[PDB]
């Protein structure tokens, strides 16, 4: 259109890190096709929102108040402190008040009502109606033991987030040849093309060529008749082209979005693996037209146009059901939930093992299947399960409806429950076999719904499509269907916030240059981190940006001296950031790292999952202390990460008494005391200790992180204890003797908070087990998403061993006691291993 409007298609590109016009490595319009189609969805919930709620997107839970929190509320009373500049007073609020109603106990208390209730140095409001207790801010408070500081301000311009203007014959495939530029290795070996029909990872028949020794050339020109027919083939189909010697792996769709059957020529760029993963699933094909392998392709053959059980028999059925949802399904089994479809779909948890069990490659079958989904009673009605709906977003289903039915289950999700899946959702996308999905289209919404929402959003999908060259893709057209609806408001944050981040790796990468990998740190690379800072500062660092983790938390200018290099491998870059926000409480400098090297994505997958494991134990009334800091990753092996203050390495603390690389029980309870300015302070950093020794000790024992180095694991001068670089003789979990010498056990004994501890751990242990299949299935999915080449069942299923599952409660208590043991006996001999 206009000149104007190139100009704002411009601004997209480098928003997003990818040029969505781009029309050079597709076959096909599926991405002007979903681009186009995301325009309703999206026009459909912005001009669907509230002006004014958007704006101020106020952060609320609907979960009740836990038990451990109603301690501190013990007189149901709360102390809100008022700021108006030089005024502020101390109104006391019951634990049920509304933030209209709490006005009114203020304005002529005191002695127009056109004013807001907004966090102090924060983008944080208070307002709705909804109870004052279910503010997350204000829960946040009650947990660390701190005041709730608000200002009186005039509420933020909903003028301001304004959206611009806007056949039976069975199926055959004639691979015709391949060709690649280099391929020079050491022995010579034999290479032939393997064809395979995909739906949900099964392979419905398999063809293979005729084995040729590799050269730079290979052509065959023959066809390949798979037995199933035109007619059978399932929506979502995929044609698996893959070249074993595997070496190279391409996919192309069998029916395309308009349920038109694929014909003609196709010239495939196909991906290499490192000598499954979802990459393993794409629908797009490699960029690098020069360097990757090709294969030429034709296709020329649209579509789509009583009885109750015996008591033995249904109790044989019931225990499929009532198996985790790593088992595999026997001949047997498989028959069993289908012949009974009718009473199988009476269990919500059965239909996991329900959708597997059915054929696809059968046209009966499906059409039977169609009409199960069309009497969905139970399902609809059902109490929403969270890892039950996880289940059929996976890559075992890509079936349309079967997969729609879950997003269904999403929809009764509030805002605080999407911040928690919100990682896990996105990262679900690259199983769908279309661009355009019900999914997609579901995080869209919610996040044009949610300024927060959408704020980490933004940053989930940013992160795959700079890294993630085979579903960038798909990604990049939901990014800018995205951006084009959160209005100008947050597209000025977002070019802010862009900026901000593009500019500092770049210095991230320079410093790291200019050092050798072994750690020493000279003044050099400490006066050219200086040199460097001191241009940033100036016209180039946009006045202030919003820290990417924390959107409330508004950064601005940079405390340059307080910046350094760690001495270590890989280096990063120390910053801490003035808050520009002037209405904050203290002098608090924001911590933030920049480093290259490690795969924050698998750093932002595990802290997600904890983020996750305390609501698990927060409705079960516990608190574990994880401290899961912020962290998101922006390109490929560089990112960003969030320093806690006060916070020192365990190891370190060892170097600060002991000796460089050579243990003392003693030292860590030492180091507690001298810090703590009083008794008191003490006592409840102590206690904070076990709470936060009992969190991460039960958490990383279950993802099998637990066997860590000494330097892997830090502790605040408060006692709060945190793992940090999750990277990627055995120890189950780190729990040495310095640590068991502060709860005041030594050497194998019994102490009040030894007793305690373990106390806390079981409780924590069996309350993640009444979770099983949550936690299950968001770890098949991390490994699947976020780790490399995984094994499709070792790495899998270590999780069904570290949850016990099978065993009962009683057996499990002892399970984990019993893994305790196993830390208590080697003590340090662990620690010092860690070198190889
Ligand atoms: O690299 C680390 C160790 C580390 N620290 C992390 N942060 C430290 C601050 O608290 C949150 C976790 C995360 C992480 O993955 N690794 N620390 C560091 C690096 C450069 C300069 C100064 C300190």
């Known amino acids: 259109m206009s000149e104007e409007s190139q100009a704002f298609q411009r601004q997209l590109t480098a928003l997003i890190g990818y040029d969505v016009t781009d029309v050079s490595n597709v076959h096909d319009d599926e991405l002007e096709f979903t681009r186009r189609g995301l325009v309703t969805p999206r026009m459909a919930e912005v001009a669907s929102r509230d002006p004014k709620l958007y704006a101020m997107h106020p952060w609320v839970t609907s979960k009740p108040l836990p038990e451990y929190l109603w301690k501190k509320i013990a007189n149901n009373c709360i102390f809100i402190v008022i700021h108006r500049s030089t005024t502020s007073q101390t109104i006391k609020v019951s634990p049920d008040d509304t933030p209209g109603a709490i006005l009114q106990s203020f304005f002529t208390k005191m002695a127009e009502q056109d004013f807001?209730?907004?966090?102090?140095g924060r983008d944080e409001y208070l307002v709705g109606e909804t109870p004052i207790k279910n503010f997350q801010w204000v829960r946040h408070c009650l947990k660390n033991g701190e005041e709730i500081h608000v200002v009186l301000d005039?509420?933020?311009?909903?003028?301001?987030?304004?959206?611009?203007?806007?056949?039976?014959?069975?199926?055959?495939?004639?691979?015709?040849?391949?060709?690649?530029?280099?391929?020079?290795?050491?022995?010579?070996?034999?290479?032939?093309?393997?064809?395979?029909?995909?739906?949900?990872?099964?392979?419905?028949?398999?063809?293979?060529?005729?084995?040729k020794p590799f050269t730079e050339e290979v052509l065959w020109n023959v066809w390949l008749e798979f037995s199933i027919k035109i007619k059978d083939?399932?929506?979502?189909?995929?044609?698996?082209?893959?070249?074993?010697?595997?070496?190279?792996?391409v996919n192309l769709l069998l029916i395309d979005h308009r349920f038109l059957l694929r014909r003609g020529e196709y010239v495939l760029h196909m991906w290499q693996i490192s000598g499954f993963n979802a990459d393993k699933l794409t629908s797009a094909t490699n960029p690098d037209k020069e360097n990757s392998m090709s294969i030429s392709i034709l296709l020329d053959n649209h579509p789509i146009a009583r009885a109750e059980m015996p008591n033995q028999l249904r109790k044989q059925l019931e225990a499929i059901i009532a198996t985790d949802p790593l088992n595999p399904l026997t001949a047997e089994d498989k028959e069993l939930l289908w012949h009974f479809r009718y009473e199988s779909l009476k269990h919500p948890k059965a239909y996991p093992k329900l959708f597997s069990s059915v054929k696809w490659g059968q046209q009966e079958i499906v059409a039977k299947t169609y009409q199960l989904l069309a009497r969905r009673e139970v399902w609809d009605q059902s109490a929403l399960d969270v890892g039950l709906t996880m289940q059929l977003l996976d890559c075992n289903f890509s079936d349309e409806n079967v997969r729609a039915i879950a997003v269904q289950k999403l929809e009764s999700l509030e805002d605080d429950d999407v911040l928690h899946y919100l990682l896990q959702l996105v990262q679900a996308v690259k199983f769908e076999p279309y661009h355009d999905s019900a999914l997609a289209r579901f995080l869209?919404?919610?996040?044009?719904?949610?300024?927060?929402?959408?704020?980490?959003?933004?940053?989930?999908?940013?992160?795959?499509?700079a890294q993630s060259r085979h579903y960038q893709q798909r990604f990049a057209v939901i990014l800018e269907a995205y951006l084009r609806?959160?209005?100008?408001?947050?597209?000025?944050?977002?070019?802010?916030?862009?900026?901000?981040?593009?500019?500092?790796?770049?210095v991230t990468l320079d410093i790291k240059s200019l050092?050798?990998?072994?750690?020493?740190?000279?003044?050099?690379?400490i006066s050219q981190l200086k040199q460097k800072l001191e241009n940033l500062q100036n016209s180039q660092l946009p006045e202030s940006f919003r820290v990417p983790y924390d959107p409330g938390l508004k950064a601005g200018a940079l405390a340059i001296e307080k910046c350094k290099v760690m001495a270590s491998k890989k280096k990063p870059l120390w910053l801490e950031f003035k808050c520009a926000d002037p209405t904050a409480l203290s002098n608090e400098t924001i911590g933030i790292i920049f480093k290259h090297g490690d795969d924050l994505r698998q750093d932002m997958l595990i802290l997600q999952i904890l983020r996750i494991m305390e609501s698990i134990w927060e409705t079960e009334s516990l608190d574990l202390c994880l401290l899961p800091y912020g962290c998101i990753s922006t390109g490929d092996k560089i990112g960003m990460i969030e320093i806690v203050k006060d916070a020192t390495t365990?190891?370190?603390?060892?170097?600060?008494?002991?000796?460089?690389?050579?243990?003392?029980?003693?030292?860590?309870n030492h180091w507690l005391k001298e810090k703590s300015p009083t008794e008191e302070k003490f006592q409840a950093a102590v206690e904070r200790?076990?709470?936060?020794?009992?969190?991460?000790?039960?958490?990383?024992?279950?993802?099998?992180?637990?066997?860590?180095?000494?330097?892997?694991?830090?502790?605040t001068e408060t006692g709060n204890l945190f793992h940090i670089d999750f990277g990627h003789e055995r120890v189950p979990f780190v729990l040495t003797p310095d640590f068991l010498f502060v709860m005041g056990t030594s050497g194998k004994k019994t102490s009040p908070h030894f007793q305690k501890f373990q106390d806390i751990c079981v409780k924590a242990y069996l309350a993640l087990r009444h979770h099983t299949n949550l936690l299950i299935i968001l770890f098949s999915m991390m490994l699947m998403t976020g780790m490399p080449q995984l094994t499709s069942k070792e790495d899998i299923e270590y999780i069904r061993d570290a949850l016990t599952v099978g065993k009962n409660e009683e057996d499990a208590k002892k399970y984990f006691l019993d893994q305790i043991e196993v830390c208590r006996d080697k003590g340090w001999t662990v620690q010092f291993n860690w070198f190889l």
């Open 233 to 249: 083939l399932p929506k979502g189909a995929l044609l698996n082209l893959q070249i074993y010697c595997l070496l190279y792996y």
């Open 689 to 715: 200790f076990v709470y936060s020794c009992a969190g991460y000790c039960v958490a990383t024992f279950v993802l099998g992180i637990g066997d860590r180095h000494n330097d892997n694991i830090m502790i």
């Open 444 to 465: 869209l919404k919610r996040g044009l719904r949610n300024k927060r929402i959408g704020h980490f959003l933004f940053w989930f999908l940013r992160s795959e499509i």
């Open 515 to 525: 050092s050798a990998e072994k750690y020493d740190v000279s003044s050099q690379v």
């Open 485 to 506: 609806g959160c209005g100008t408001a947050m597209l000025h944050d977002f070019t802010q916030q862009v900026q901000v981040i593009e500019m500092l790796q770049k």
């Open 650 to 668: 365990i190891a370190k603390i060892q170097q600060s008494t002991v000796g460089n690389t050579g243990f003392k029980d003693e030292v860590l």
């Open 116 to 120: 807001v209730l907004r966090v102090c």
């Open 154 to 211: 005039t509420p933020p311009d909903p003028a301001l987030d304004e959206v611009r203007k806007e056949c039976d014959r069975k199926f055959r495939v004639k691979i015709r040849g391949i060709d690649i530029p280099v391929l020079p290795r050491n022995t010579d070996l034999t290479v032939f093309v393997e064809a395979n029909i995909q739906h949900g990872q099964q392979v419905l028949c398999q063809r293979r060529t005729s084995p």
